[PDB]
Assembly symmetry: C6
Homo-oligomer: 264 residues x 6
C-alpha cells in the first residue's frame, strides 16, 4: 500500500518511508531520478515478487494477476520536497558482492544494455536472437507480436521497470521495448547531438539501480537523432550505461560493454 | 434543432478530487487516482483523458439499436461526456510516470476494413489536400465523418457528418461508433497538431498517436483519422515515417491521390 | 443574473451550473470560444435580446455606447478554472443553422470569418470603404482621424470586439473588425505561432453556429518569404479571405454553399 | 487611498472599483495594459490634480509635495482576475469632443509622440527644441541635466504616466525621458525586427489613453535595434502611436504624425 | 577570527508580510508595501532590494569613528543586513511597475575621485584582464576592495580586502564606506552578469546598472565596480556602449592598460 | 538536532533560527552553498566531528558506508523557501583560514576546487591514478570495474559528494570527485549555461573557507570550437585546473600563495 495523496507535513511524518509519504528512503527503498520525476524501488517487495515468480509456472499469468504487487515494487512517492532534499539526485554506482553474469555478454557489468537504432534498424530482430524470456512492451503501437509473441504489455515506467526488475532478480531475461516515452518525455536543455541531457542522466540513474540490484535489463532506445549528430549521441549514451549495441540497416554497427574484467 | 444535455444524470467528478488515501483509491470518475477495471487512461500531451468501457459498451448497443446514429449522438451529450472524460485528480501525472497505453488485442478480433487483417488502432490519412482527403474519405463508405477543429464548409451542412467541439467527444463518438459496428472517421486531429507543443513536429504528437492508437487496439477497433502535420516539404518524409511508426496504419495522399499505404496486420 | 467574476464552483453541485454562474458545464445557450489559452463564452440568449434592441435604434454606434453592460454579458470569460482540463483541445463545432442564406461578402458565402489581410493603411481603408459596412469595430489600433469622423465603435478587449460584431450581424448589419492586431501579438506558441490559426477557426466556427459572417482585418506580419504560405494557412482556417496588394485584390478564396 | 493587498473574494466585492480591489473599472477608471501588467488611471483624481496644478505657481514643488495624489492618479490594481476578465485588453481609440492641438504639430492626434533613436542620436537635444515645460526623468542614469535642468525625476511607470497626464491636462507640455524600462522590461515573443511584440501593443495602449484624455505626451524611446531591422522596427512603432520622430546622428531622419485632418 | 552576527537586534521582517491594508501601509522593513522616507527600493532583475538611509548614515559615522574599517564590517553583519535587505512583501513588483531609481543629486555634492566633478553613481571598470583590472584597482588608492563572486586568491589573504557573499552586503559595505568618506570598489559584479537572465547581454543587466547607479547618485557617492560582461569580441564595443549609457562613468581596460574612459560630470 | 525537512519558519521568531532548524539566518557554523537555483548548507561543526571520527578509522571508504546519516547532516538543503529572496545572487565569500598551507595538487595551491577536464576514460583514470588519492568519490557515472575493485565510495547526490569530500580533506586525506556530470547536465541557464561557472566558484570558495582542496572531474561537453574559451571560463572560476589531451597534461593553471 502506497501513499497517493497524503504527504508528510510534520518532521515526524517526514522521517517515514517514501511509501508512507515521508521524505527519507527506507533501508529497502532506492530512489530513481528520471528527468524531473523521482521513482522508488522497494527491494523487499522486489524480493517477495522474485521469490514468488521463481515459484510460479507461468511468468505470463503471474504478472497479469499481480499488478498490485507490481505497483508496490516501483512507485512514485508523493512527498514533494524530494527534489530539494536530494539535489541533483543520481543512483550510486555499486555492485553486489559475488555478482556474476554470462548474459548478454560474459562479465557484463550490472546495468542497462541498450539496443539502439532508428526505425527499421533491426531492433526487434536482434531481440529475437538474444534468447529472452519475454519482451516487456511499453509505449509502442500494438503489433502482431503482441498477440503471437512472448510479451507482457505495460502502461507506464513504473510497471516497465518493476516487471524487468522482478524478472531479472528471478533469474529470467527481460527486454523493454521500448524507452520511446523517455526519449519523447524527458525534455531538457539540448546538447551537441540534439538530445536532452536529462535523457543521459536518466539512463545512468536507471543503469545504476540495475547495478545495485545486480541485474542486466536490455532496453530498446531510438534516440531520434539526425545522421550528423548520431555518432555523438550514441557516444553519450554509451558513456551513460553498462552496455550498448547499435543497429543500422539490420546489422550490428557498434558494441560497447563494460565488463567485470575491463576486457572484452 | 438542438442537442440535449442532461446534466442531472452525470457522475463524473468535475471539481472535487481525492484529499485522503481512502478517496484516492476510488475510480477516476469519482475523483480518485486509481482506475477501475473498466477505465483506461489516455495520455495526450500534458493531459490525461479516460475511457469508460462499461459506458462505452452500453452506448454502442443503444446506438446500434437506434434509428439514426446522428440523432442519437445529438440527443446524448451526457452519455458522450460520460464515455470519455478528463479526470479531476491532479496527481495522475506523478503516479503514472511517462504514461502510455498498453498494446493489446482482444481475443477473436477480426477486421476487413480498412484492409484485410488490419491491426486495431488508428489509421491516419495524412497529407494536405482538402479536396484529396475528403475525396478519399468519401470512398471508404464511412457511416459519417466526425468533424472537429476544421472550419465549417458545405459538407457540414450537406454530408453525413457529426460536428464535435473537443478531443473527449471526438474520441467518444468514434469509439461508440466503431464498437457498435459503424465506420467512423475523424476530420481532423488539426488541434492535436497545433495544441501539442514539445524533425519539425513536437515529439509528443507521436506518443499521443501511439497512446490513442493503443486505446483503439485494446477496444478492438479501427478509427480512421485525418492528420495534417504541417511539415516543411523537405522534412515531410521523415515526419510521415515517424507517424507511421506510431500507429496501426497510415495512408499518404499526394496532389489528390493515395500514394502510399502502410498497415500492420494480424495472422 | 450577472456573470460570476471571482466565485467559481467548489462542489459537484455548483460545477453543474452554467459558465455565467461559475460552473463548468455550458447551458444550451452558451457557446465556449477558445482563443489561445483563454476560454470565452457567448450567451446566445443575451445576444438575441441585444440584436432585437439594437434593431430598434437609428444608430448602431450610439446603441453600443448606451449599452456597455449588456455587451459584457453577451461575451465573457468564465471564472471556473478547470475548463481547460474538462474540454481538452477545445474548438467550436462546425455547424450552420437551418435555412441559412447569404449574399455578402459574396454569394452563398459560408458563415464564419472573412479575413482581409495585408494591403496597407490607405489600402485597407479603401477596401473596407468599398464593402458597404454598417460600421467598423476599432480595436487595438492607435486613434486616427477615422475614429473621430467615421462610422465606428471603439472597443477595448476581445470580448467587446466579438460581442459588438455578433450583435450587429444577428441584427442584419454588416460589421468589420479593425483589427485582430492583439490576437497576432497576444497569442504566442510554437513563422507564425500556430495557435493563431486554431483561434481563428474557433472564432470562425462560432460565427457559423450563429449563422453570420464577420469581416476582420488581420496582418500576421510574416516575412515576405513565408507570406504566401502564411496566407494559405489562414485561408484553411476560415470561411473566406481576401489578400490585398497595392490597393487591389490579389487573391480571394471563399467557401460557399449551393 | 488604493487597495494594495486585499482583493475581492465575493461577487459583491468584485463589482467595486479597481481602486477598492474590485474587478470592474469605475466610471472614471481606465485600464492600461502594459505587457502583462494592468494599470489604471483615475480621471477624477487626474482632474483634481490638473485643476490644482493649474492653480499653483510651481509645477516643480507641486509634484514633489503631492506624490500621494500622484500615486492615486495612476496605480496598479490588486485584483488578479483582470487578465482573464478583459482578454487581450487594449485601450479603445476615442478622441474627446472638441479636441484641438497646435503642439507638437498642428492637429496632432491625441496620443504619444515618440522621439526615437539610438544612443547619441540627438534625442536630448531635440527635446530642448520642443519648448517643453519639463522633462520627466525615468529609468536613465543621473546627469548634469537632473541638477541644472527643468526636470521632475520619478521611479516607476505609474509616476511617469501620472505626472505626464496631470501636466498635459493642466495645459502644460511634458516629455518622458525615457521608456527605457518598457524596452528592457516588456519581454515577449519577438518579431522580424527583434523587438517584443508586446512593446508595440503597450505603446498603442498608452497612446490610446492619451487619446481618451485628449492629450499628447512626448516620449523618448531607444528600441535597441540593429541596423538591419531598425527600419522595420521604426515602422511597427509608427504603426502603434500618434506621432513619431526618428533621430539619427543629430538630425531628424523621419517624421510621421497622425492628424485630425489626415494631412500633414 | 570570525564575524559576529547579533540576530537578536534585527528588525527586518523575513517571513511575515502584510495581509491587510493597514499592514500594507507599513515600511518595507516591517513587511509592508510602502517605503518610508528613508527607504529606497533597488530593482535588480526580478528582485527588489531596499536601502535604509537612516541605518546607512549611522553605520557610516560609526565606521568613520572606528579604528579599523575591516574589523568593523566583520563585527557588524547585523547592521550590514539592516542597511540593505530584500523586503518580504510579494506585491512590490505589481505596485511599482517597471521600477527604477529616480535620478537625483543631493545639494552641495562635490567629488574629485575618480575624476574632477564626477557625477555620483557607479564607475564601471570593464574588461577581462585579471592582472589588468587588479593592477588598475591598486592604482586608485582604494581603502579596500569588496570581494564578491570571484574565486579566492592571494589578494584575499594578502591585500586590503573584505569578502562578502551576496548583493545586499556588497552594496551595503560599499554604501557605508563611501558615505563615511572611504573609497570602496566592488570586485566584482560577476554574479549580476551571470544571474540576471533576460546585442549579447541580458538587457536587464543594463537597467540593473542604472538602478544601482541612481541609488548611488541619490546617496551622493561613487562606487567603483568591476564588471566583465562576457561579450564576444565582435559585439564587445556595442555592449560597452550600452553599459556606458547606463552609469555615471566607465573605464575600459585592454590587454593590461586603461584604453577608454567616459565620465558624466557636473558644472 | 536533526535537519528540518518540511517544517519551515512561519513567524519572525522562527525565521531567526538556523538553517538546520528551518530558519532563514545561518548560524556561525553554517555556510550556504548556492548551486544553480538550489541552496545547500555545510555545518562546519558536524564536519569537524566527522573528520575526527574518520581519522580514527583504518579505512575511509568503510567509514562513510558506516555513517550515512552523519553525512546528510554535514551538507543539506535547508527547508526555508525564502532563502533565494533573502540572499540575492548568493555566492560564497573568498576567504582562507589563518596559517593555511598546501603542497598538493601543487605547492602553495590555493584552497578551492582543482578541476580535471577533458581527456578520455582511460586517460582520466590514469591522471587520477597518478595523483595518490585517498579515494575517488564516484557520483553520477555508470558502474564500471573501478566501482568494484578500486579505492572508491559511491554516492547518489551532490550533498553526499560534497560532504564526503569535505570530511576527507579536513581529516587530511586527498579526495577526488568523479564526477560533476550532473552539475553539467542539471544546471541549465543562458555554449555553456552560465550558472555552471558561478556554481563552481561557490563550491570553490567554500573549499577556500574550509582551507581544503578538492579535485573534481568535469567534462563540460563543449564543441571543439568553443572548447578553448570554455576552459578559460572554468579556470577563471576556480583555484586550479588541469586540461588533459590524449593522456597528457596540455594546460595547468593554479592560483597560489607565497
Amino acid at each position: 500500500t502506497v501513499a497517493l495523496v497524503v504527504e508528510a507535513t510534520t518532521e515526524a511524518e517526514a522521517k517515514k518511508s517514501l511509501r508512507e509519504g515521508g521524505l527519507v528512503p527506507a533501508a529497502h527503498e532506492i530512489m530513481i531520478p528520471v528527468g524531473n520525476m523521482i521513482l522508488a524501488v522497494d527491494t523487499q517487495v522486489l524480493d517477495k515478487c522474485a521469490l514468488a515468480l521463481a515459484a510460479s509456472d507461468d511468468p505470463g499469468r503471474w504478472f497479469a494477476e499481480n499488478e498490485s504487487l507490481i505497483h508496490s515494487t516501483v512507485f512514485a512517492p508523493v512527498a514533494k520536497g524530494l527534489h530539494r532534499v536530494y539535489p541533483l539526485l543520481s543512483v550510486r554506482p555499486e555492485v553486489p558482492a559475488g555478482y556474476e553474469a554470462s548474459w548478454p555478454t560474459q562479465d557484463h557489468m550490472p546495468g542497462l544494455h541498450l539496443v539502439v537504432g532508428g526505425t527499421g534498424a533491426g531492433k526487434s530482430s536482434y531481440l529475437a536472437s538474444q534468447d529472452l524470456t519475454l519482451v516487456i512492451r511499453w509505449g509502442e503501437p500494438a503489433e502482431r507480436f503482441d498477440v503471437e509473441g512472448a510479451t507482457h504489455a505495460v502502461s507506464d515506467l513504473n510497471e516497465a521497470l518493476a516487471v524487468a526488475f522482478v524478472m531479472a532478480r528471478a533469474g529470467y531475461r527481460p527486454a523493454i521495448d521500448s524507452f520511446r516515452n523517455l526519449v519523447f518525455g524527458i525534455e531538457s536543455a539540448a546538447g551537441e547531438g540534439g538530445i536532452s541531457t536529462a535523457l543521459y542522466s536518466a539512463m545512468t540513474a536507471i543503469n545504476n539501480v540495475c547495478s545495485r540490484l545486480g541485474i542486466v535489463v536490455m532496453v530498446v532506445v531510438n534516440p531520434m537523432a539526425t545522421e550528423a549528430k548520431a555518432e555523438l549521441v550514441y557516444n553519450n549514451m554509451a558513456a551513460s550505461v553498462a552496455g550498448m549495441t547499435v543497429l543500422m540497416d539490420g546489422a550490428v554497427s557498434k558494441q560497447t560493454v563494460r565488463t567485470l574484467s575491463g576486457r572484452t
